[PDB]
Design a protein around this ligand. Sequence first.
Ligand SMILES: Cc1cc2nc3c(=O)[nH]c(=O)nc-3n(C[C@H](O)[C@H](O)[C@H](O)COP(=O)(O)OP(=O)(O)OC[C@H]3O[C@@H](n4cnc5c(N)ncnc54)[C@H](O)[C@@H]3O)c2cc1C
Ligand SMILES: Cc1cc2nc3c(=O)[nH]c(=O)nc-3n(C[C@H](O)[C@H](O)[C@H](O)COP(=O)(O)OP(=O)(O)OC[C@H]3O[C@@H](n4cnc5c(N)ncnc54)[C@H](O)[C@@H]3O)c2cc1C
Ligand SMILES: C=C1C(=O)C=Cc2ccccc21
Ligand SMILES: C=C1C(=O)C=Cc2ccccc21
Lengths: 588, 588
Amino acid sequence: GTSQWLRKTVDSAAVILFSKTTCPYCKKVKDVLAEAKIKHATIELDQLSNGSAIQKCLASFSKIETVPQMFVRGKFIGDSQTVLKYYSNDELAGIVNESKYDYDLIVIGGGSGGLAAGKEAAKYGAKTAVLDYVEPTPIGTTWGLGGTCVNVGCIPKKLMHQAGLLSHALEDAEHFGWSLDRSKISHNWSTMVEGVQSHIGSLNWGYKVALRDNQVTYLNAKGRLISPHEVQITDKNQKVSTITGNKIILATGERPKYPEIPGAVEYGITSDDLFSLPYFPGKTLVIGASYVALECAGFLASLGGDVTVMVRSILLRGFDQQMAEKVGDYMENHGVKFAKLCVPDEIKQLKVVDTENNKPGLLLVKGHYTDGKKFEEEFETVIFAVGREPQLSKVLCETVGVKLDKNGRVVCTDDEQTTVSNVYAIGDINAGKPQLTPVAIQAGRYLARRLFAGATELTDYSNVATTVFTPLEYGACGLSEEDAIEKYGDKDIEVYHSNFKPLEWTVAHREDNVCYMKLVCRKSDNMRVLGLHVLGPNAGEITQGYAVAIKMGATKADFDRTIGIHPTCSETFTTLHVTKKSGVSPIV
Amino acid sequence: GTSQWLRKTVDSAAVILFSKTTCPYCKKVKDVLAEAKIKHATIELDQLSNGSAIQKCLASFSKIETVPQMFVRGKFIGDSQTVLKYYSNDELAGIVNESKYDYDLIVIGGGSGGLAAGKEAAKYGAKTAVLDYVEPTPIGTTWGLGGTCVNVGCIPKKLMHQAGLLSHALEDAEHFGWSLDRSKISHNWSTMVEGVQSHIGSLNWGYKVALRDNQVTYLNAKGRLISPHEVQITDKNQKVSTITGNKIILATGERPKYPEIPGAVEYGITSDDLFSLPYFPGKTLVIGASYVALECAGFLASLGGDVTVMVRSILLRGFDQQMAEKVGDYMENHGVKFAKLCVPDEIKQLKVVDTENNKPGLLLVKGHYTDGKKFEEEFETVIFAVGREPQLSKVLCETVGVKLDKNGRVVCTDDEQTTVSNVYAIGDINAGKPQLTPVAIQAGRYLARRLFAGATELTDYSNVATTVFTPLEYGACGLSEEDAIEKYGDKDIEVYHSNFKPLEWTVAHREDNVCYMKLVCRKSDNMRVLGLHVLGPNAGEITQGYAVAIKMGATKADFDRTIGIHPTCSETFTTLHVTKKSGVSPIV
Ligand SMILES: Cc1cc2nc3c(=O)[nH]c(=O)nc-3n(C[C@H](O)[C@H](O)[C@H](O)COP(=O)(O)OP(=O)(O)OC[C@H]3O[C@@H](n4cnc5c(N)ncnc54)[C@H](O)[C@@H]3O)c2cc1C
Ligand SMILES: Cc1cc2nc3c(=O)[nH]c(=O)nc-3n(C[C@H](O)[C@H](O)[C@H](O)COP(=O)(O)OP(=O)(O)OC[C@H]3O[C@@H](n4cnc5c(N)ncnc54)[C@H](O)[C@@H]3O)c2cc1C
Ligand SMILES: C=C1C(=O)C=Cc2ccccc21
Ligand SMILES: C=C1C(=O)C=Cc2ccccc21
């Protein structure tokens, strides 16, 4: 048991020390490495149950049982003195620093997971290189380091959400007494895009800095794994070179799909273009139903745009459909038009995008409804959010044996290992895992600690909370109501729910009985909270805390004996009492 | 054991039925009471571990072991047939309805706890009366039903907070692209007060309705307990009468204190006056340091007022003082002036309040600093928030034996019982308990279930989360850092902390490294989270969820293995790693 673990650890760590807190010559060599600016992992045997056996099983590797014991890339490098003996004659640089390969770790893709993994690995001695490149969109849009979230995802998405929410803040401010000229307030897209792009620019550059500050080599180069330990890089000159690493982390993410219809690539855009668009989109058609589609339709409308969403079948497939319908219901009642049960057939261009005056072109979208009537309408902008797909054929010489699935994602063990044992996959390309930035970050950091500091903890992908940043936000943790009934049967499921009304909405004359929340519980398992769902303002702030309790096995009674904070939206979870089976109405 | 419990239950319940789910004639009599509009508690013996012994120990009271068994005010009223036998001849009204006293329950005081207790008791058959009266402030301010929170507390306080936050929303909106005329935006106090008063009016009346709809008798009358079961009421005619109840719940709350200096009662105001004030306060001096003082100084300043806070010694005594200083630091840097280590000696009137044009008067505040220099400054309004005190001498003929403490609050057992066994105390007047509306509500509801439906659960007063609604909010659950070190010693305490920055603040050019959060943990108890502290926007929404986990015994590792929601402020709790002992800086 313990020896399978120590075998992996010693082979994988680049620079690691085993030590004790209460023993001198442990303390003694740490300070010397410090002084020498040589980074390393450390395992305080005094602080593990296992430590007993390990310092003893350790002698299988060193012929030794003293602490300290220092290893480098799988090989014992000595005692108290043999290492001082290396600083001694100044030979502790080419010792800690030589490897079969150029790097302990090459990370391919510089997004949420890849930068997080790279950084944490460098923190324990790993010689690390991060590759990143951004294949432009069909119109030539590109961006800097940081990945989908930072550049064309949650970050700009949420800022434009915020700008949208300020619309309702400007409305609300009048009823709270502010002298406000709503007959003279407009929104300027270019000003907003420039502020958003300036904060993105500062994150692109904060990430370069951060890589430099942690002795990580950043390469603006496309990476192709040609063999388990070999990565071919092509740079901005199209110059081709080869580099070698012991561990490889694939973290290349996905890019938007287009539908295969005439004029879609040529005249439509995706989220990749939206957030740096020079010109206001104007009257916009969003094609799709993902949380991406509704988030974008949502703030465009709150920015005053004329917005339409084309929905092939249902909203937010994969999410609790009662909540999805409530989300959709709020947007329809606040400006968003929905062309329901409708697909596109062609996009025909009527006007070309004016680089001159930064104004959109004009498109004719032709489509058909399920009922056979034809869709034909003009839009200045058409945005596809019909899903996202990995681009790995462009990264994995399929000679190398990294097994992909149907959808092009990487088949992984529970510790992120691919079918090539030194190659791991994190983030959106890891088949079957939730596709979210914090997941990718915990995966990369936790994996980096297993590789290079002997950690054991795996990433827990279960009950990962989400929030959809539609005009009215929807946060969730755990199962939808339909999935809990599927798994356990209707009679084993109790659902407590309630409408509520933000105090902020009262003076502001917003809706009663629109915001809503519910706990899905297992009668047979002590009313274990299996899924939490909340529709209302600040739904992410609300939900996050409860994801800790749920991960701990919260039951209904745990919610009930917690005392609310007043006045908040979140406190309503601590007083829920109407059940669905009751028939009683959740209104307030 | 079980029999001590059933003895209390049968004596106390007004109308209660013992039953089984899977037995007919249980189901049989419920529907008949339903049809008869007679409310009652119900205890499904099939659903308790205890049920075994109880249906058997039940025969000590009825001479019976059948279900159903129905009692009224301590006395068995029969079987399947003896009750149908009472509906039968129409005598089931004066049976369920007669008592030694006019009421199963008189609640004295119609505030958060009292209305919640009254309502829940009526729901199980208790004949209930709620008394409420509002002694005017020294200037004659009064208000309707609902208590401190609804009328002159968290509700108006938080709405005026909101109006204050919209000030920064109007600022923020420009950087997010909105064409906004800040050289032409003012705030109108009277418009805001009127909106706030209109929502309060609708709550005053929603509460009257709710009492009427639950067959509760509401009396706008001052109540005085003259004997354990006798309450003297004086109405708006000063007509004096007497009423009797079996159980008495004292829920009369507190009223603001004034300092004993010339001109304070005559020319100053309290929070009781602030929220209905006809006129803008104008240049204002807030005397005090409570969360009340800072909340009010805070939104007045965000409303554009010239605001000064007079602080005798420290801010927010009783709260974590590192956080208190950060709260204070933010307000000082955003307009609030602090006259530190300063007390008032006299208020002299310079101008009388103009009922005519609704404009404040003018005051000269004379005071002295600790350093001996004299304070002397003009203010249009002066507000005292120097604490709050119960007024029970005006309610308890001290003949009756309800033991008060030093401060005038009621000494209670863990189940809210006073020293007179049928008389309970809830809310702010219950000595030693946190003084918060949701506490009072859970106390009253939970107590009502023990009295009248045989419930056993007590209210848990430990680890009750709070939020202070200063311009930058401060939420907390559990111990301050200083109290954890006092209780467990410095070397047993680890503190993880971090600065953070709302995404919303970036484009808006607000402060880096001002918002802040920390977990106070017990090294010796598995890094058990002993106190959580967060300074930032939406601090109540953030904190609430975590209070469930903490009540469940959350450790640091429970926080770490939870995955964040991105992008949120709250997610930063799931990635904390800098410790205080580390010396490393919490910045970002
Ligand atoms: C519009 C939108 C909104 C979103 N909002 C949220 C949200 O609010 N919250 C949330 O949690 N998640 C959100 N997501 C999801 C989130 O952005 C992703 O989960 C996250 O970016 C994925 O991280 P990753 O490490 O898997 O890859 P990415 O962050 O996509 O990074 C992969 C990187 O690798 C580069 N690359 C690709 N191929 C190569 C190659 N051969 N060589 C070198 N580099 C290469 C790519 O150009 C890119 O820089 C959003 C996504 C979208 C599209
Ligand atoms: C400015 C301010 C802001 C606050 N903000 C918050 C906040 O944000 N969150 C929070 O949780 N708490 C807050 N609090 C505290 C909260 O308002 C109280 O905890 C709560 O109102 C106390 O409830 P209670 O049932 O003890 O009494 P109260 O709500 O005070 O009600 C007592 C009632 O009894 C009446 N009464 C008194 N004597 C008699 C008598 N003899 N006969 C009949 N009726 C009588 C009183 O007039 C009053 O209506 C705030 C308090 C203040 C002052
Ligand atoms: C259920 C919906 C809804 O409520 C609002 C809009 C919508 C659009 C497309 C499909 C379904 C819906
Ligand atoms: C510690 C303080 C602070 O930071 C700001 C203001 C203040 C006022 C009175 C007492 C203390 C403080």
